[PDB]
Design a protein around this ligand. Sequence first.
Ligand SMILES: CO[C@@H]1O[C@H](CO)[C@H](O)[C@H](OC(=O)c2ccc(C)cc2)[C@@H]1OC(C)=O
Lengths: 134, 134
Amino acid sequence: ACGLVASNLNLKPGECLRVRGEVAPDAKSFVLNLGKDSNNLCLHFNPRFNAHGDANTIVCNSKDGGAWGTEQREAVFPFQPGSVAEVCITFDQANLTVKLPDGYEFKFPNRLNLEAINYMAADGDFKIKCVAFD
Amino acid sequence: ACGLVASNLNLKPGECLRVRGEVAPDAKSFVLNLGKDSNNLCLHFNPRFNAHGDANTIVCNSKDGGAWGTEQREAVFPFQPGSVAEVCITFDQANLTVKLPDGYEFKFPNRLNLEAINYMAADGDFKIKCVAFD
Ligand SMILES: CO[C@@H]1O[C@H](CO)[C@H](O)[C@H](OC(=O)c2ccc(C)cc2)[C@@H]1OC(C)=O
């Protein structure tokens, strides 16, 4: 990850992680990775503007002991290149909930059954400006 | 260390790092470390409420290639246990400038001559709630 990497987050169920960043004006893609560590991700969150044969599609996946799971593709894309976006993430036993710009929301199963999020990494065309824990 | 650890900050000269956190009601001390990595710190910032013989004193130092430099104490102590505190940090070639609650500002010489600040770690009796880069 070229972007910010943070560990020892100690984010517990029902706590809200808010991340605000700048989307590059020539953005192709960006990634937010969340989990225990780099090899154990409960959420790989990958908005693709124009990358890997995908246009304006959010792709999500998990990684378990180094092995990627099966990707899920979402139905909404409320990001624009060249703009500031905020993403809010919370989790419980069964699901991660991601709240996006403009009132959009989706869920992704908690496949690792993690009880804390301790690692966050960003990559691609997204510059983090603010991180907050509520 | 036990607190938040962040890398790839890419904080450049003139940019502001703002960190806000909760100081435990029974706080003895907390640490914020900034630099390149855990062996190369341009600033080790250590408010002692009651620790290692010292009361209501800010200790600062650097660490270069694993070796602690010459420690310095500041006279002002604008922290209270059991409250929220924000510290703002910026640097240039000559100095770090640390702005504290209640308006107090001090400079600490930049002994490492780093191009950017890429590493931050918090430790002790301070829970990070928000970090911002501008
Ligand atoms: C001269 O002893 C050292 O002085 C140094 C400054 O010159 C450091 O402050 C160091 O403490 C620490 O690195 C540290 C780390 C974590 C926490 C919670 C507290 C202190 C240590 O102080 C002592 C006594 O450890």
